[PDB]
């Protein structure tokens, strides 16, 4: 079978980004030893090791949706993947408010129409299980108390 | 009392103005600085049996109007499933 | 005019899913980073990224050899799923301004970049030249506004929408990591477009519409025909629980309705518990199956069911912002049926920027 490739964006500190950029544009396999990525079983934490120097990483959710588009003639472009995550290196914390481009900054706060967390469904599933495992349930919409 | 050219031209100019606003903001390379109706909560009492013999009762209060809506919507639907 | 990849026009399941559940409809076009169970990345620990520069230039030199061996004209290259990898070719990125657009391309579909250039009054030097796309001189503005004299505007143009794009240079810190089961791979990016508000060219159907139910029935029929084509036994035969694995929300009465014509169930003897193909039935050819369902209809259906989920999760203003209403409003405005209030609540920005596509008389 075929599995859709999973592309994400890696953001590095600027000096480390310059060393990684120089090693990528060089093209040797020396970069392979120099740059490693360890993703922790949290799923939202990691180390990126540039030249064997550890950097602390967080995999965050991006507010917009990006799409990689490949081409052979620079006139027709074929969509290859959807990018929604970024492993910035240096829950609410795992959500990035800004977009990658310069015009998109504070997009989630200003350029996004109010949208719901769809979280609440999981909380309702937790309450329903407790109700069904009980015997007697008493409910009242309340006031200030 | 125009019911024709006035409405059409007004819509057209708002379209060009909106479009003009849209192109400029997006192509900007300028850096941007980082920046219920009833007022009623929901409380639930739960009765359960502990290991050996016990009958403890739990009173739990949900102050989130979002959890409220989804909870009671299901309860109202169930009141009508029978 | 738009020629999608052969995985896209044949509606392969990895790229065009048969069924999307609720947690997969909430993560529509935002696929999370999945953990592998088997493979090299499934073992926990540090993993080296691998620089592909020799792979990119080897594949580009090989494709140029293929093009010059075929007479030197323009060629069609995306014939396999392995052509649609990010490991080769010139990648650009495309960011969207809206959170949830009315229409959005699936993986494997093609789009074009058109540079609309309105000449200056009288003498003009020529279109400011651009790295990507082809230039066209537009007297009649494609979008809602009109181009200024001497203004070039790039745009994504395909069968789904048409939207103004704006080329920005990438940040100096961001690279692109393509992870697969075997390892990590890194490219740099230099070009990233920002896509403005889309102008929809395809109408998203409504829920329980006639076009909606027709697309569901035709998609199920195309999947059944392609399972019959993949069958190796001579009286081609399929199993029902393959279709029940693909379409699990379907009642089995509908699947048996699709299999009633073109197949019959064998209970006993040979081919038992199989749905063999009827001997008088001519299985349709590849071009007929391609003419049954279009990929843009699948994108419109996916937009409808994703918006159905978002509205369902959020308990009339929101209903107006649903893509069937907004696509109907914009296409009706383009024929001149009706006008749109350009300031309203269907505005995907939430501020004065951007349009709202809801009908006004």
Coordinates of C-alpha atoms in Angstrom, one line a residue:
Chain A
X1 CA 0.0 0.0 0.0
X2 CA 1.0 3.7 0.0
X3 CA 1.1 5.9 3.2
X4 CA 0.8 9.7 2.7
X5 CA 4.2 11.3 3.7
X6 CA 4.1 13.4 6.8
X7 CA 6.0 16.7 6.3
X8 CA 6.5 19.3 9.1
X9 CA 8.5 22.5 9.5
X10 CA 11.6 22.6 11.7
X11 CA 12.4 26.0 13.2
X12 CA 15.9 26.4 14.7
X13 CA 17.7 29.2 16.6
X14 CA 19.3 31.5 14.0
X15 CA 23.0 30.6 14.4
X16 CA 22.1 26.9 14.5
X17 CA 19.8 27.5 11.5
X18 CA 22.7 29.1 9.6
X19 CA 24.9 26.0 10.3
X20 CA 22.2 23.6 9.3
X21 CA 21.5 25.6 6.2
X22 CA 25.2 25.6 5.2
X23 CA 25.4 21.9 5.8
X24 CA 22.2 21.2 3.8
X25 CA 23.3 23.3 0.8
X26 CA 26.7 21.6 0.9
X27 CA 25.0 18.2 0.4
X28 CA 27.4 15.7 2.0
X29 CA 26.3 12.9 4.4
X30 CA 28.4 14.7 7.0
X31 CA 25.1 16.6 7.8
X32 CA 23.4 13.3 8.5
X33 CA 25.7 12.6 11.6
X34 CA 25.5 16.3 12.6
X35 CA 21.7 16.7 12.7
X36 CA 19.5 14.3 14.7
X37 CA 15.9 14.5 16.0
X38 CA 14.7 12.6 19.1
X39 CA 10.9 12.8 19.7
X40 CA 9.8 12.1 23.2
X41 CA 6.8 9.8 24.0
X42 CA 4.8 12.9 25.2
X43 CA 4.4 13.5 21.4
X44 CA 4.9 17.3 21.9
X45 CA 8.5 17.4 23.1
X46 CA 11.8 16.7 21.6
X47 CA 15.5 17.3 21.2
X48 CA 17.0 18.5 18.0
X49 CA 20.8 17.9 18.2
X50 CA 22.8 20.2 15.9
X51 CA 26.5 19.3 15.7
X52 CA 25.8 17.1 18.8
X53 CA 24.5 20.2 20.8
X54 CA 21.1 19.4 22.3
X55 CA 18.2 22.0 21.8
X56 CA 14.8 21.7 23.4
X57 CA 11.9 21.3 21.1
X58 CA 8.1 21.5 21.1
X59 CA 5.8 20.3 18.3
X60 CA 3.2 22.9 18.0
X61 CA 0.0 23.3 15.9
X62 CA -0.1 25.9 13.3
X63 CA -3.1 28.2 12.9
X64 CA -3.3 28.1 9.1
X65 CA -2.9 25.1 6.8
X66 CA 0.0 24.9 4.5
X67 CA 0.4 22.6 1.5
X68 CA 3.6 21.5 -0.3
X69 CA 3.3 21.9 -4.0
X70 CA 5.9 20.3 -6.3
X71 CA 6.5 21.1 -10.0
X72 CA 8.5 20.0 -13.0
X73 CA 7.9 23.0 -15.3
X74 CA 7.0 25.8 -12.8
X75 CA 3.6 26.2 -14.5
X76 CA 1.5 23.3 -13.1
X77 CA 1.9 22.5 -9.4
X78 CA 0.9 19.2 -7.8
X79 CA -0.1 19.1 -4.1
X80 CA 2.2 16.6 -2.2
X81 CA 1.2 17.0 1.5
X82 CA -0.5 19.1 4.1
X83 CA 1.6 20.8 6.8
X84 CA 0.1 21.8 10.1
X85 CA 2.9 21.2 12.6
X86 CA 6.2 22.8 13.5
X87 CA 9.0 21.6 15.7
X88 CA 10.2 24.9 17.2
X89 CA 13.5 24.5 19.0
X90 CA 15.5 26.8 21.4
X91 CA -2.7 21.9 25.1
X92 CA -2.7 25.7 25.0
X93 CA 1.2 25.7 25.0
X94 CA 1.2 23.4 21.9
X95 CA -0.9 25.8 19.9
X96 CA 1.0 28.5 17.8
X97 CA -0.9 31.8 17.4
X98 CA 1.2 33.2 14.5
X99 CA 1.6 32.0 11.0
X100 CA 4.9 31.4 9.2
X101 CA 4.7 34.3 6.7
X102 CA 5.2 37.9 7.7
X103 CA 1.6 39.1 6.9
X104 CA 0.2 36.4 9.1
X105 CA 1.1 37.4 12.6
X106 CA -1.5 37.1 15.5
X107 CA -3.7 35.4 12.8
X108 CA -5.5 33.2 15.4
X109 CA -6.4 36.3 17.5
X110 CA -7.1 38.8 14.7
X111 CA -7.6 37.3 11.2
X112 CA -9.6 34.3 12.4
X113 CA -13.4 34.4 12.7
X114 CA -14.4 33.0 16.2
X115 CA -14.3 29.2 16.0
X116 CA -15.0 26.4 18.6
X117 CA -12.3 23.9 20.0
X118 CA -13.9 21.3 17.6
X119 CA -12.1 18.5 24.1
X120 CA -15.7 19.1 25.4
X121 CA -16.9 15.8 23.8
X122 CA -14.1 13.9 25.6
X123 CA -15.2 15.6 28.9
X124 CA -18.9 14.6 28.2
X125 CA -17.7 11.0 27.5
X126 CA -15.9 11.0 30.9
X127 CA -19.2 12.2 32.7
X128 CA -21.5 9.7 30.9
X129 CA -19.4 6.7 32.0
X130 CA -19.7 7.9 35.7
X131 CA -23.5 8.4 35.3
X132 CA -23.9 4.8 33.8
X133 CA -21.8 3.3 36.6
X134 CA -24.0 4.9 39.3
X135 CA -27.4 4.0 40.8
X136 CA -29.3 7.3 41.5
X137 CA -28.6 10.7 39.7
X138 CA -30.0 14.0 41.0
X139 CA -29.7 17.2 38.8
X140 CA -30.7 20.9 39.1
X141 CA -29.7 24.0 37.0
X142 CA -28.4 26.2 39.8
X143 CA -28.0 29.8 40.7
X144 CA -25.2 31.7 42.6
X145 CA -23.9 29.4 45.4
Chain B
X1 CA -35.1 56.4 -4.8
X2 CA -32.7 54.3 -7.0
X3 CA -33.3 50.5 -6.9
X4 CA -30.9 49.7 -9.8
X5 CA -27.6 51.6 -10.6
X6 CA -27.2 52.8 -7.0
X7 CA -27.2 49.3 -5.5
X8 CA -25.2 47.8 -8.3
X9 CA -22.4 50.5 -8.2
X10 CA -22.4 50.5 -4.4
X11 CA -21.8 46.7 -4.4
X12 CA -19.1 47.1 -7.1
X13 CA -17.1 49.8 -5.3
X14 CA -17.3 47.9 -1.9
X15 CA -15.9 44.9 -3.9
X16 CA -13.0 46.9 -5.3
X17 CA -12.2 48.6 -2.0
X18 CA -12.4 45.2 -0.1
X19 CA -10.1 43.6 -2.7
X20 CA -7.7 46.5 -2.5
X21 CA -7.6 46.2 1.3
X22 CA -7.0 42.4 0.9
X23 CA -4.0 42.7 -1.5
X24 CA -2.1 45.3 0.4
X25 CA -2.4 43.7 3.8
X26 CA -1.4 40.3 2.5
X27 CA 1.6 41.4 0.5
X28 CA 2.9 43.6 3.4
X29 CA 6.5 42.6 4.4
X30 CA 6.1 44.9 7.4
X31 CA 6.9 43.1 10.7
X32 CA 3.8 42.9 13.0
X33 CA 4.4 43.1 16.8
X34 CA 3.4 40.0 18.8
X35 CA 0.3 41.0 20.9
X36 CA -25.2 31.0 29.5
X37 CA -28.3 33.2 28.9
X38 CA -29.7 32.0 32.3
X39 CA -26.4 32.5 34.2
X40 CA -27.0 29.0 35.6
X41 CA -24.3 26.3 36.4
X42 CA -25.0 22.5 36.4
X43 CA -24.7 20.3 39.5
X44 CA -24.9 16.4 39.5
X45 CA -25.4 14.1 42.5
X46 CA -24.1 10.5 41.9
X47 CA -24.9 7.4 44.1
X48 CA -22.4 4.5 44.0
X49 CA -21.6 1.3 46.0
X50 CA -18.0 1.0 47.4
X51 CA -16.1 -2.4 47.8
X52 CA -17.5 -4.5 50.8
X53 CA -20.6 -2.5 51.8
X54 CA -20.9 1.3 51.4
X55 CA -23.3 3.8 49.7
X56 CA -21.3 7.1 49.2
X57 CA -23.0 10.0 47.2
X58 CA -20.9 12.4 45.0
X59 CA -22.1 15.9 44.3
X60 CA -20.2 17.4 41.3
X61 CA -20.8 20.9 40.0
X62 CA -20.0 21.8 36.3
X63 CA -19.4 25.6 35.9
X64 CA -18.5 25.3 32.2
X65 CA -21.4 26.4 30.0
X66 CA -20.0 24.2 27.1
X67 CA -20.0 21.0 29.1
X68 CA -23.4 21.9 30.4
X69 CA -25.0 22.2 26.9
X70 CA -23.6 18.9 25.6
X71 CA -24.5 17.1 28.9
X72 CA -28.1 18.3 29.2
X73 CA -28.7 18.1 25.4
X74 CA -28.0 14.3 25.6
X75 CA -30.2 14.0 28.8
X76 CA -33.1 15.8 27.0
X77 CA -32.7 13.5 24.0
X78 CA -32.7 10.4 26.3
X79 CA -35.9 11.7 28.0
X80 CA -37.4 11.4 24.5
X81 CA -35.7 8.1 23.5
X82 CA -38.2 6.4 25.9
Chain C
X1 CA -7.4 21.8 -18.8
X2 CA -6.1 20.8 -15.4
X3 CA -4.5 17.3 -15.5
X4 CA -4.3 15.7 -12.1
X5 CA -2.0 12.8 -11.3
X6 CA -3.0 9.3 -12.2
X7 CA -3.4 8.5 -8.5
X8 CA -5.8 11.4 -8.2
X9 CA -8.0 10.8 -11.3
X10 CA -8.3 7.1 -10.3
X11 CA -9.4 8.1 -6.7
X12 CA -6.9 6.0 -4.8
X13 CA -7.9 5.6 -1.1
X14 CA -4.6 6.9 0.5
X15 CA -5.2 10.2 -1.3
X16 CA -9.0 10.2 -1.5
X17 CA -10.4 8.5 1.6
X18 CA -13.6 6.4 1.4
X19 CA -14.7 7.2 5.0
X20 CA -13.7 9.9 7.5
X21 CA -14.8 9.6 11.1
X22 CA -15.5 12.4 13.5
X23 CA -11.9 12.7 14.9
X24 CA -10.6 12.6 11.3
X25 CA -13.2 15.2 10.2
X26 CA -12.0 17.5 13.0
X27 CA -8.5 17.0 11.8
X28 CA -9.5 17.7 8.2
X29 CA -6.4 19.0 6.2
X30 CA -4.5 19.1 9.5
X31 CA -3.1 15.6 9.9
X32 CA -1.3 15.0 13.1
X33 CA 2.1 13.5 13.4
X34 CA 1.4 9.8 13.8
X35 CA 3.6 7.4 15.8
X36 CA 4.7 4.4 13.8
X37 CA 4.3 0.9 15.2
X38 CA 6.8 -0.9 12.9
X39 CA 9.7 0.6 11.1
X40 CA 13.0 2.4 11.8
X41 CA 11.3 5.4 13.4
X42 CA 9.1 3.2 15.5
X43 CA 12.1 2.3 17.7
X44 CA 12.5 5.1 20.3
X45 CA 15.8 7.2 20.3
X46 CA 17.7 9.9 18.3
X47 CA 17.3 9.6 14.5
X48 CA 19.6 11.2 11.9
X49 CA 18.0 13.3 9.2
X50 CA 19.3 12.7 5.7
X51 CA 20.2 15.4 3.2
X52 CA 18.6 14.8 -0.2
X53 CA 20.4 17.1 -2.8
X54 CA 21.9 14.2 -4.9
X55 CA 18.4 12.7 -5.0
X56 CA 16.8 15.9 -6.2
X57 CA 19.3 16.6 -9.0
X58 CA 19.5 13.0 -10.0
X59 CA 15.7 12.8 -10.4
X60 CA 15.6 16.2 -12.2
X61 CA 18.3 15.1 -14.6
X62 CA 16.5 11.8 -15.2
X63 CA 13.2 13.6 -15.9
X64 CA 15.0 15.9 -18.4
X65 CA 16.5 12.8 -20.1
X66 CA 13.0 11.4 -20.3
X67 CA 11.6 14.6 -21.8
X68 CA 14.4 15.0 -24.3
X69 CA 14.0 11.3 -25.3
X70 CA 10.3 11.9 -26.0
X71 CA 10.9 14.7 -28.5
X72 CA 11.5 17.6 -26.2
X73 CA 8.0 18.9 -25.7
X74 CA 6.1 19.1 -22.4
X75 CA 5.6 15.8 -20.8
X76 CA 3.3 14.2 -18.2
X77 CA 5.3 12.8 -15.3
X78 CA 3.0 12.1 -12.3
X79 CA 2.0 8.6 -13.2
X80 CA 2.7 6.7 -10.0
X81 CA 2.2 7.5 -6.3
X82 CA 6.0 7.6 -5.9
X83 CA 6.0 10.6 -8.2
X84 CA 4.1 12.6 -5.6
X85 CA 6.8 12.5 -2.9
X86 CA 8.3 15.7 -1.6
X87 CA 11.8 14.2 -2.0
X88 CA 12.1 15.5 -5.6
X89 CA 11.1 18.4 -7.8
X90 CA 10.9 22.1 -7.0
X91 CA 8.7 22.5 -3.9
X92 CA 7.0 25.7 -2.9
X93 CA 4.8 26.2 0.1
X94 CA 1.3 27.7 0.0
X95 CA -0.3 29.1 3.2
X96 CA -4.0 29.9 3.5
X97 CA -5.5 33.0 5.0
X98 CA -8.8 31.5 6.0
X99 CA -9.0 28.8 8.7
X100 CA -11.5 26.6 6.8
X101 CA -11.9 27.3 3.2
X102 CA -15.0 26.4 1.2
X103 CA -12.9 24.1 -1.1
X104 CA -9.5 22.6 -0.7
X105 CA -7.4 20.3 -2.9
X106 CA -6.6 16.8 -2.0
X107 CA -3.1 15.3 -2.3
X108 CA -2.2 14.5 -5.9
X109 CA -4.3 17.2 -7.6
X110 CA -2.9 19.8 -9.9
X111 CA -3.3 23.6 -9.9
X112 CA -1.9 26.3 -12.1
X113 CA -0.4 29.7 -11.4
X114 CA -1.8 32.5 -13.6
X115 CA -0.2 36.0 -13.5
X116 CA -3.0 38.4 -14.4
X117 CA -1.5 41.7 -15.7
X118 CA -3.6 44.7 -16.7
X119 CA -1.6 46.8 -19.1
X120 CA -1.1 50.5 -18.4
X121 CA -3.3 53.0 -20.4
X122 CA -1.6 53.4 -23.8
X123 CA 2.1 52.4 -23.7
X124 CA 3.3 49.7 -21.1
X125 CA 6.8 48.1 -20.7
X126 CA 5.4 44.5 -20.3
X127 CA 4.3 42.2 -17.4
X128 CA 6.8 42.4 -14.5
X129 CA 8.3 39.0 -15.0
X130 CA 7.6 36.3 -12.3
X131 CA 9.5 33.1 -11.5
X132 CA 6.4 30.8 -11.4
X133 CA 3.3 30.6 -13.6
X134 CA 2.3 31.9 -17.0
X135 CA 1.2 35.5 -17.7
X136 CA -2.1 36.4 -19.1
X137 CA -3.4 39.9 -19.8
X138 CA -6.8 40.4 -18.1
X139 CA -9.0 43.2 -19.3
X140 CA -11.9 41.7 -17.3
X141 CA -10.8 41.1 -13.7
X142 CA -11.3 37.4 -12.7
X143 CA -11.8 38.4 -9.0
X144 CA -14.5 40.6 -7.4
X145 CA -12.4 43.7 -7.6
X146 CA -10.7 45.1 -10.7
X147 CA -7.0 45.3 -11.3
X148 CA -5.2 48.6 -11.4
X149 CA -3.4 49.6 -14.6
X150 CA 0.1 48.1 -14.5
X151 CA -0.7 45.7 -11.6
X152 CA 0.3 42.1 -11.9
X153 CA -1.6 39.7 -9.5
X154 CA -0.7 36.0 -9.3
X155 CA -3.4 33.5 -8.6
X156 CA -4.0 29.8 -8.1
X157 CA -6.3 28.6 -10.8
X158 CA -7.8 25.2 -11.0
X159 CA -11.3 23.6 -11.3
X160 CA -12.0 24.0 -7.6
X161 CA -11.4 27.7 -6.9
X162 CA -9.4 30.7 -8.0
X163 CA -7.5 32.6 -5.4
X164 CA -5.0 35.5 -5.3
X165 CA -1.6 34.3 -4.1
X166 CA 1.3 36.5 -2.9
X167 CA 4.9 35.4 -3.0
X168 CA 6.9 35.8 0.2
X169 CA 10.4 34.7 1.0
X170 CA 10.7 32.0 3.7
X171 CA 12.0 32.7 7.2
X172 CA 15.7 32.2 7.6
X173 CA 15.2 29.6 10.4
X174 CA 12.6 27.2 8.9
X175 CA 13.4 24.0 7.0
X176 CA 11.1 21.2 5.8
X177 CA 11.4 17.7 7.3
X178 CA 9.8 14.9 5.4
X179 CA 9.4 11.9 7.7
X180 CA 8.5 8.5 6.5
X181 CA 8.8 5.1 8.1
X182 CA 12.5 4.7 7.3
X183 CA 13.8 8.1 8.4
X184 CA 13.8 11.9 8.3
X185 CA 14.8 13.9 5.3
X186 CA 15.4 17.7 5.1
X187 CA 14.9 20.2 2.3
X188 CA 15.2 23.9 2.5
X189 CA 12.4 26.1 1.2
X190 CA 12.8 29.5 -0.4
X191 CA 9.3 30.4 -1.8
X192 CA 6.1 30.5 0.2
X193 CA 2.9 31.9 -1.1
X194 CA 0.1 33.4 0.9
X195 CA -3.3 32.5 -0.5
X196 CA -6.0 35.1 -0.2
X197 CA -9.8 34.5 0.0
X198 CA -10.9 31.9 -2.5
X199 CA -13.3 32.5 -5.3
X200 CA -15.2 29.2 -5.5
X201 CA -15.8 27.8 -9.0
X202 CA -17.4 24.5 -7.8
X203 CA -20.6 24.3 -5.7
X204 CA -20.3 22.3 -2.5
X205 CA -23.6 20.3 -2.2
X206 CA -25.7 20.6 0.9
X207 CA -26.3 17.8 3.4
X208 CA -28.9 15.2 2.3
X209 CA -29.0 16.9 -1.1
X210 CA -29.7 15.1 -4.3
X211 CA -26.2 15.8 -5.6
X212 CA -24.8 14.6 -2.2
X213 CA -26.6 11.3 -2.3
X214 CA -25.7 10.9 -6.0
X215 CA -22.0 11.4 -5.2
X216 CA -22.1 8.9 -2.3
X217 CA -23.8 6.3 -4.6
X218 CA -21.4 6.9 -7.5
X219 CA -18.3 6.8 -5.2
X220 CA -19.4 3.5 -3.8
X221 CA -20.0 2.2 -7.3
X222 CA -16.6 3.3 -8.5
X223 CA -15.0 1.6 -5.5
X224 CA -16.9 -1.6 -6.2
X225 CA -15.8 -1.6 -9.9
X226 CA -12.2 -1.0 -9.0
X227 CA -12.4 -3.9 -6.5
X228 CA -13.7 -6.1 -9.3
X229 CA -10.9 -5.0 -11.6
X230 CA -8.3 -5.9 -8.9
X231 CA -9.7 -9.4 -8.5
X232 CA -7.5 -12.2 -9.8
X233 CA -10.0 -15.1 -10.0
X234 CA -11.5 -15.4 -13.5
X235 CA -15.2 -15.0 -12.8
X236 CA -14.0 -11.8 -10.9
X237 CA -15.2 -12.0 -7.3
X238 CA -15.1 -9.7 -4.3
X239 CA -15.9 -10.0 -0.6
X240 CA -18.5 -7.9 1.1
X241 CA -16.5 -7.0 4.2
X242 CA -13.9 -5.4 2.1
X243 CA -16.6 -2.9 1.2
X244 CA -17.7 -2.8 4.8
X245 CA -14.2 -2.0 5.9
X246 CA -14.0 0.9 3.3
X247 CA -17.5 2.3 3.9
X248 CA -18.5 1.4 7.5
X249 CA -21.1 4.1 8.0
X250 CA -23.1 2.6 5.1
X251 CA -26.0 0.4 5.8
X252 CA -25.5 -2.9 4.1
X253 CA -28.8 -2.5 2.2
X254 CA -27.2 0.2 0.1
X255 CA -24.1 -1.9 -0.6
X256 CA -26.2 -4.8 -1.6
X257 CA -28.2 -2.4 -3.8
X258 CA -25.0 -1.5 -5.6
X259 CA -24.0 -5.1 -5.9
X260 CA -27.5 -6.3 -7.0
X261 CA -26.9 -5.3 -10.6
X262 CA -23.4 -6.4 -11.7
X263 CA -22.9 -9.2 -9.1
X264 CA -24.5 -12.2 -7.5
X265 CA -23.9 -14.0 -4.2
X266 CA -22.7 -17.6 -4.2
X267 CA -23.6 -19.4 -1.0
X268 CA -22.5 -23.0 -1.8
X269 CA -20.0 -24.9 -3.9
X270 CA -17.1 -23.0 -5.4
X271 CA -16.9 -19.2 -4.9
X272 CA -18.9 -19.6 -1.7
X273 CA -19.5 -16.4 0.3
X274 CA -18.2 -14.4 -2.6
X275 CA -20.0 -11.9 -4.8
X276 CA -19.0 -13.1 -8.3
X277 CA -19.4 -10.8 -11.3
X278 CA -22.3 -11.6 -13.6
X279 CA -21.2 -13.2 -16.9
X280 CA -23.4 -10.9 -19.1
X281 CA -22.1 -7.8 -17.3
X282 CA -19.4 -5.9 -19.1
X283 CA -17.2 -4.3 -16.4
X284 CA -16.6 -0.7 -17.4
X285 CA -13.2 0.4 -18.8
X286 CA -10.9 2.7 -17.0
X287 CA -12.0 5.9 -18.8
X288 CA -15.7 5.1 -18.1
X289 CA -14.9 4.7 -14.4
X290 CA -13.0 8.0 -14.5
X291 CA -16.0 9.6 -16.2
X292 CA -18.2 8.4 -13.3
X293 CA -16.7 10.4 -10.5
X294 CA -14.4 13.5 -10.8
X295 CA -11.9 14.4 -8.0
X296 CA -13.4 17.9 -7.6
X297 CA -16.7 16.3 -6.7
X298 CA -14.9 14.3 -4.0
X299 CA -13.3 17.6 -2.7
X300 CA -16.7 19.2 -2.6
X301 CA -18.1 16.2 -0.7
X302 CA -15.3 16.3 1.8
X303 CA -15.8 20.0 2.4
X304 CA -19.5 19.4 3.0
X305 CA -19.0 16.6 5.5
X306 CA -16.2 18.5 7.3
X307 CA -18.5 21.5 7.6
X308 CA -21.3 19.3 8.8
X309 CA -19.0 18.0 11.6
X310 CA -17.9 21.5 12.6
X311 CA -21.5 22.9 12.7
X312 CA -22.7 19.7 14.5
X313 CA -20.0 20.1 17.2
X314 CA -20.9 23.8 17.6
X315 CA -24.5 23.2 18.5
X316 CA -28.4 30.7 11.7
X317 CA -25.3 32.9 11.2
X318 CA -23.0 29.9 11.3
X319 CA -25.3 28.1 8.8
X320 CA -24.8 31.0 6.4
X321 CA -21.0 30.5 6.7
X322 CA -21.5 26.9 5.6
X323 CA -19.8 26.2 2.2
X324 CA -22.9 25.0 0.4
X325 CA -24.5 28.4 1.1
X326 CA -21.4 30.5 0.3
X327 CA -20.5 28.5 -2.9
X328 CA -24.1 28.9 -4.1
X329 CA -24.0 32.6 -3.3
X330 CA -20.7 33.2 -5.1
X331 CA -21.6 31.2 -8.2
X332 CA -25.0 32.9 -8.4
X333 CA -23.3 36.3 -8.1
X334 CA -20.9 35.4 -10.9
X335 CA -23.8 34.6 -13.3
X336 CA -25.4 37.9 -12.2
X337 CA -28.4 36.3 -10.5
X338 CA -28.0 38.2 -7.3
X339 CA -25.6 40.4 -5.3
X340 CA -23.6 39.7 -2.1
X341 CA -23.3 41.7 1.0
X342 CA -19.5 42.1 1.1
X343 CA -19.6 43.0 4.8
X344 CA -21.4 40.4 6.9
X345 CA -20.9 37.4 9.1
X346 CA -19.7 35.0 6.4
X347 CA -16.5 37.0 6.4
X348 CA -13.7 34.4 7.2
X349 CA -11.4 37.1 8.7
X350 CA -13.8 38.3 11.4
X351 CA -12.7 41.9 10.6
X352 CA -13.2 44.3 7.7
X353 CA -10.7 42.4 5.5
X354 CA -12.1 39.8 3.2
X355 CA -15.5 39.3 1.6
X356 CA -18.7 37.5 2.8
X357 CA -20.5 35.4 0.2
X358 CA -24.1 35.4 1.2
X359 CA -26.9 36.4 -1.2
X360 CA -28.6 39.7 -1.2
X361 CA -31.4 40.6 -3.7

